[PDB]
Symmetry: C2
Subunit: 333 residues, 2 copies
């Protein structure tokens, strides 16, 4: 490998090789040369090298790794039954990796070697270049796709205070002053947003819009609107998209389906959060046909379930189903 | 060690990143370790599996000593502390001349100037040097059969790059003296082909045309009527060819005497002293200087100094200078 001892690794004797097995792991002997860890594999039987690890089925282009898992990121080279890889991140979290792989000192090695993730299950994903790796990492870190969530096909995005109902609508009196991607202030106070981690400069701006429902929200928006900068409205939205996502996450995990929400692909999580968000989180009660297929892991059935909801919002239900269907088509489900 | 992979060593591909351990063939207690395709020589006090046991330190003087020019050496650079030593091999069992060239290289400047430098000798013993310049001078002493600077200094054979006639008409040795150059190279019984055979470059051999073979009255007149000045470098090259040719003659005589050591095992200054006396008096020291020769072959260093100091031949001062070189070797522990 080029530049094999440059940069840093995230978590006169050293002139000699020292071999250690990584505690709690199988087939994970490490060799420390010059204080750096090096992961080697051999087809041929050896005392010091690992056996060849199998390649993951996870899509390098569109896949993710669970945000609840630690990963090992390696860079190196391989040819005819022998692999030698510098360990860049050893069982770090995805957020730590992202950060580490951005550091200037690590650019040389990352740019002129083959880059791979060694998963907690000891399978590997081989990336075409470091930018593909970093993008994989950035998909893995988000609970849902916030760009998909805020697109017009889903929750949309309006940075100006808006009232998404009218005086003749069934939902007039429960609708509140809304910002960004469906953040309704009708039953929230300033302290609430502050408690939820909303920056004080944003929460201070919304004074006068809090706790207004029905006619009072409607009139307020009509005469005295307020526009947030896109950066702030996105910030505000994403806090609530993520907060709501953990509620869906918990419902999924509690069901003990044989996987955790974080094991689902990104677009499927987005689809489940989206329908929960519009219909209410208790999908067992608010979308039974959908939840039946989820808890059964019948993904083709799940698509079908979304296609079959006629709830006055089938346009969105079909868009949710298409996200799951995209995961099926790309081999993620 | 600093810059442990930054140079060269005188001695399908992904596999070099794996340490390869190998025993040096036809050689004892010399396990090597190849990391990144570089030989590393390591030593450890307690019983290790793939390193060497601690090597005994040679008694040879790092400041003044030499190693036999007939021996191959191993040159290493690295670090040690508290019973563990790790040295990058820079030259593995190379000749002295080879080592000289290799260590002057622009590649190797960094590793040698920022590490400890040592020689591992053929007998597995070690000489530790204070710096690379010291080690380099140690090599320059070792490579030369005699000290050429001492030889050509005024106290010994002197040096005159101009055709000269070191005698005069009334002198006992007038008729046998020829045209002389550098440090006592006399051409009276030599032809252009004799110099070419001894390895004198064509261009210098060319310059001396018509000075060859002249002796006595004719050499004297030639010097007086048409002198010839060589450059100092041409004259030093010519001289060192003859000094080395003569030194090998003395070496042959010493080695054939079966004293229990070879000529190359003698200190530089003692070798120089023996050649100097032979060069002036006749190489067959057993006949031309028996009191000196008798002490040499008895390895009686003290009596050898005494032999030189007692020679009466009308060249007393030079004889005592030759004795003083040997006495320097005794004083610094080399004899």
């Amino acid at each position: 490998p080029a530049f094999l001892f440059s940069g840093s690794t995230l978590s006169i004797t050293i002139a000699l090789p020292h071999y250690v097995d990584l505690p709690g792991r199988s087939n994970f002997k490490l060799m420390y040369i010059m204080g750096f860890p090096i992961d080697t594999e051999m087809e041929k039987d050896s005392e010091y090298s690992n056996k060849i690890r199998q390649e993951s089925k996870i899509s390098k282009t569109e896949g993710t790794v669970s945000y609840e898992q630690k990963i090992t990121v390696e860079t190196g080279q391989e040819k005819d039954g022998v692999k030698v890889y510098r360990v860049m991140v050893l069982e770090g979290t995805i957020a730590e990796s992202i950060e580490h792989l951005d550091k200037k000192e690590n650019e040389d090695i990352l740019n002129n070697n083959r880059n791979r993730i060694v998963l907690a299950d000891n399978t590997v994903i081989n990336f075409d270049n470091i930018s593909q790796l970093k993008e994989f990492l950035r998909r893995s870190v988000n609970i849902v796709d916030h760009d998909i969530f805020s697109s017009n096909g889903f929750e949309g995005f309006n940075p100006t205070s808006h009232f998404p109902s009218n005086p003749s609508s069934d939902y007039f009196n429960s609708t509140g002053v809304t910002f960004g991607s469906g953040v309704d202030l009708g039953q929230r106070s300033k302290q609430d947003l502050l408690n939820d981690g909303v920056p004080q400069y944003i929460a201070d701006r919304l004074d006068g819009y809090y706790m207004l429902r029905g006619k009072e929200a409607y009139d307020k928006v009509r005469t005295a609107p307020l526009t947030l900068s896109d950066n702030e409205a996105h910030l505000l939205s994403n806090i609530y998209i993520d907060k709501f996502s953990h509620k869906i996450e918990g419902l999924f995990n509690d069901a003990n389906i044989g996987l955790r929400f974080s094991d689902l692909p990104l677009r499927t999580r987005t689809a489940l959060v989206s329908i929960g968000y519009q219909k209410g989180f208790k999908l067992s009660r608010t979308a039974p046909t959908v939840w039946n297929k989820v808890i059964a892991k019948d993904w083709n059935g799940l698509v079908n379930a979304f296609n079959n909801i006629v709830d006055g919002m089938s346009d969105r239900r079909k868009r949710e189903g298409a996200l799951v269907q995209k995961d099926i088509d790309s081999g993620l489900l």
